[PDB]
Subunit: 386 residues, 4 copies
């Protein structure tokens, strides 16, 4: 039951299943994985593909000859398995040089270095067939108020993104960028902390059409925000270029639990939205197999991500298709929500005595919304209790 | 010391000092205030002006003759005191008709009614001299996932805002709109939950130049976000049309404490930013004198808002002017943050061996940022311990 | 399917289904319910009983003759339906006199009044057959640091509880007290904010055996705490005298959603714990039918509380009974967790070279815990995907 | 101004200033410090002493001869400087063996090992003169619900603590234990998550008099709790054996900012409470110099901890001593809060018509608490604006 296949478009970062378990308070609990092994094991599980940071695939500091060999072996694994690489990103956070940021480091030399490191990897991402290039500005921010003038930092961030858009345009690449927001951790506050902030920022770029968002479940939940609502807004804006799926139990450190763990009902409403909107991009998991687990547990966690997506997909579909639910949705006036408020125009609205002078506000107020009955139908579908 | 005058541009909502103390679990602890009394008392405290919801000034359901008399007496108080009315807003949340929203109610008749109620009040706001019209979509949202299709709701919200922009344009009014975001309460999740979400939404409106934001301290803090950072972004976008000042102790119900209470250091960095950016609009307080207080305590709380702003203004100014701080800011490379990363252009960056092939990343990494020393100078200034 | 009967011990507060929908920003959306109607309607739904605050049953200020008639009619409804009243409590929060608390009001006269109001109602609770008397110190706390000396307030709270224990003892009543913790709202911070704080406090009372806790799902979740873990601790202490079931979506205002909404997986693990521990008390719902709902929606929400409990009970039972789960639990060493660490004693532990000098820490470290596989079995059971 | 001296009893963990800057997403930014250097540098700053985990002082795996030399050199530094070691603790979290806990690991062998590792270090702590032995159960908990039966885990935790109390008693040591609560991180939820939970647990131990708490500012703030209120309760219980001072900006990952950063007003009310209660133990800082900082910044951050404590101490003292504040405190009835509610006894209270039948609740309700004026006096004192 609920067996993934590559047509489901499930993808995983190399850094997910490859996480060695080092946390702020603990040493590694697992050995490093060869990317080749991870491709092979994921393929066996039904995955469609993998994503990488530059430094996951090619150890920082590698010679060109080493670099060539790492890529060659990785490409052989993809060829052996039929796995794709839909997305890649740059590690602008691990090396101590990025301690005050990459693109918005106070030190100009560091900003220039961050751009050069990104550009090098964009070339590689294209060669591997990636359609999306993610930027996660995890070190862009501050722990204290004087340390970063945020207007200056946003000027730097815009400059960076504008230069990367010039580069892709100059090379004739089809690849697009996706900003992954996060509100805090590792910096006390991170710039562009939410989907809303990233969307707004994009509209200030020279070529806004090249940039979207890569929202992560856990990250919006770390601000206590409603993830399906943020995704709806991104979709509404035409900017959902990629999505990062995982779980998170509330407002705390970034847990990166397997998808479906954490807020299960939010997961349900997310899959409902993605499927009903016809989202066609990768279903990418950015999760950490807990450091309690050995390698068998790693592969169990990854299989569980995909399984949970497919179960929720089934239940959401059954929800939307159920004639009793369709009736409930009409009872709750969701059909009315989708109709124009005033397609008649402003003057007609102004002249419509039924909209004000003769509006019976007490009758309107007395009509129940019937949302509880609708929501219990949703719960019954999720739990298979219909 | 730290005595407000009207040139400080301190304003208060009628609903702030007029709050009767009714909370979810308690009845009113104070009698209603006549708006006339509130204007008079605020003026005596050094305030510049007041703001109102339609229903604060004119009781819901009033006849035209009653409406005329309420406005006449209010205008006499303004004339008697020299107080201004820089901003107004519509109550689209108290009456049970708005239980599922105003502009995004599922019921079309309610949406039309909300627009008509707003338009009526825009006319009044203009007559009273307001430059900004605030919209706080406090009932726009949901407690359950099926109850609101957010893409449909955003279509409705855009339609609403677009119609209001048509109206103001058709009448030749100079007034501009400001959206006040809030993440939750009274709905489980509110649409446009943060400054970022509101900014992004504005860029989809037919006339984006007519709309900005009215961020509230407590509201961004309820998402655990950094308020000065959100304000920086709004300023960066040219959209800080108004601001709502108050205090909040973390992620919980909307406390609306007097400004300076709550996160005191965040208040410091906010006033530093507003003053250094030359923000010229009203310094508006949206606060609730706690229901423990009698009328003397109400006026004490209001005086305290203004006092705290003025103390922080002094300390921030002293901070920025201190030659030791200026030296620390250079030590922390804040001057470098404000310089272009690559004014030489993309090709020059690509050809610059100092940016990659010959960049000494270990030397760069070893340079401390000196942010702790800078931050302690900031603390010493805030506390007057220099 | 999943039809409640009175043997399930489902109970509801009169204030739950009777909530008129007044919130901080909105007027009532529903008329008041007669308690008699609520008893009748709940009975029809399969409920076992109801609970009350003094002022839910008898309007504040009632004459003795009015008081007698209100009780008489309520008792007739219980007799007509077979409904029980297992728990009652005092309203020490709505009336403005309690604005700074009841038992810990700074004003001594108010503290004395709060005690007298409680004692009167304890007599009534006993006459109605209640076994538990709840205290929810919702106004006991502060919005500012100087307003309440917490050590003095805890002295007052102890004095209050000690006097109530003297009273029940003096009258020969079998009733026991249960403290309901809440971290904030309506006060900025509430005293005894969590289950842990209440448990600790109880151990300082003169007769600790008379006092336990009445933890509420939403309340521990408002501190971001794990509700099933808090309940485990209360059970471990022998102090789970009653429980309040509802839902809550994270750290925000107290939502009081119907049970099962909110954190669904946490609900699962709670019902698993209650059932496996053989908790025998009332399954009490403290929920608010959302103010969007009319009276039909009220009864739908209440039915949904019970339905969700029964679904989760089935799934948890199936989980624990499944031989594959039992195998997984052994693989994860849950059986070992339940065995003594050192039943051999301290000296034997000290002399055991296998515990230190010859302990192979690397072998131990390499053993995976297999928790992900266990957790996915749990998810598959919850969702009926086995 | 505000220069620390050893009589201030400021102490630091070796792991604080010695933090190399490794975070979940980043490599070390600073070299390791020799404990000897840290003692010397702290002494120069005015510190009173240092604390250690076993593994901070003696590298895990050291031979007895290596162990002897590490201790010898450390003791020479203490002798050279006059620095004390008031507290020590065991590292039961870094090594992968502790991935599922120490005392409550599901694997019995690990639990036994954790006890043996602790006991060894208790002997060392005593030899170095420590009066308090801290336990921080950072790995005791779970990320999923089936992984840990919390009642079984609490049985194991009690067994562990009981054995350690037997050991100290058997050796005639004067040292006492202090449990340091934390709600989450590194485990999804940590057992004994708050001060309240730890206090309650202690009352179940065989010798409760040997155990107290070591509350940390940031940790209670991570649950959104009021730290000064938790400290008041610990003091009320007679269990404040030690305290960990730092800063934290709200509900998020454990930031461990320097004391005074984070919630500045909460810091004020904490120092006010500690000083007014006559807390006589170490003022211990558990802080992380941000990884942006070089070694000069490390020492700046440490100096800042002490400076901020001393500034707040001055301001709190000035607050309490100010005759206008004393008048305000009487106006707010804080003196009445400190008087018994019913020293006359239960019968007299029952017979007192002024407490109920003749209590004028409307007069009582109308009396304002004057808390805003009191709180603004507090703000004016904190900011030196009197
Ligand atoms: Ca994440
Ligand atoms: Ca607010
Ligand atoms: Ca509640
Ligand atoms: Ca900490
Ligand atoms: Cl922007
Ligand atoms: Cl948008
Ligand atoms: Cl206690
Ligand atoms: Cl306990
Ligand atoms: Mg991600
Ligand atoms: Mg506001
Ligand atoms: Mg309750
Ligand atoms: Mg600590």
């Amino acid at each position: 039951n609920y067996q993934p296949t590559p047509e489901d478009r499930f993808t995983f970062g190399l850094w997910t299943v490859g996480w060695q378990g080092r946390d702020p308070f603990g040493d590694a609990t697992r050995r490093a994985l060869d990317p080749v092994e991870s491709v092979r094991r994921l393929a066996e599980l039904g995955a469609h593909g993998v994503t990488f940071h530059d430094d996951d695939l090619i150890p920082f500091g590698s010679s060109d000859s080493e670099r060539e060999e790492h890529v060659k072996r990785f490409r052989q694994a993809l060829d052996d398995t039929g796995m794709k690489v839909p997305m890649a990103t740059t590690n602008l956070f691990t090396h101590p040089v990025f301690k005050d940021g990459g693109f918005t480091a106070n030190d100009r030399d560091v900003r220039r270095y961050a751009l050069r490191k990104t550009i090098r990897n964009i070339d590689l991402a294209v060669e591997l067939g990636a359609e999306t290039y993610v930027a996660w500005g995890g070190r862009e921010g501050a722990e204290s108020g004087g340390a970063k003038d945020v207007r200056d930092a946003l000027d730097r961030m815009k400059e960076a993104f504008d230069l990367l858009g010039e580069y892709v345009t100059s090379q004739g690449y089809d690849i697009r960028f996706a900003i992954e927001p996060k509100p805090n951790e590792p910096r006390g506050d991170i710039l562009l902390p939410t989907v809303g902030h990233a969307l707004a920022f994009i509209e200030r770029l020279e070529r806004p059409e090249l940039y979207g968002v890569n929202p992560e479940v856990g990250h919006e939940q770390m601000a206590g925000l409603n993830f399906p609502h943020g995704i709806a807004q991104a979709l509404w804006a035409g900017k959902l270029f990629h999505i990062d799926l995982n779980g998170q139990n509330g407002i705390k450190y970034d847990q990166d639990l397997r998808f479906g763990a954490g807020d299960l009902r939010a997961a349900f409403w997310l899959v409902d939205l993605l499927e009903s909107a016809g989202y066609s991009g990768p279903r990418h998991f950015d999760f950490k197999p807990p450091r309690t687990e050995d390698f068998d547990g790693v592969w169990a966690s990854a299989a569980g991500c995909m399984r949970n997506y497919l179960i929720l997909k089934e239940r959401a579909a059954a929800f939307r298709a159920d004639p009793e639910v369709q009736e409930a949705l009409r009872a709750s006036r969701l059909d009315e929500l989708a109709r124009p408020t005033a397609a008649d125009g402003l003057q007609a609205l102004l002249d419509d005595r039924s909209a004000f002078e003769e509006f019976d506000v007490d009758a309107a107020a007395a009509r129940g919304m019937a949302f509880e009955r609708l929501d219990q139908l949703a719960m019954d579908h999720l739990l298979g209790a219909r």
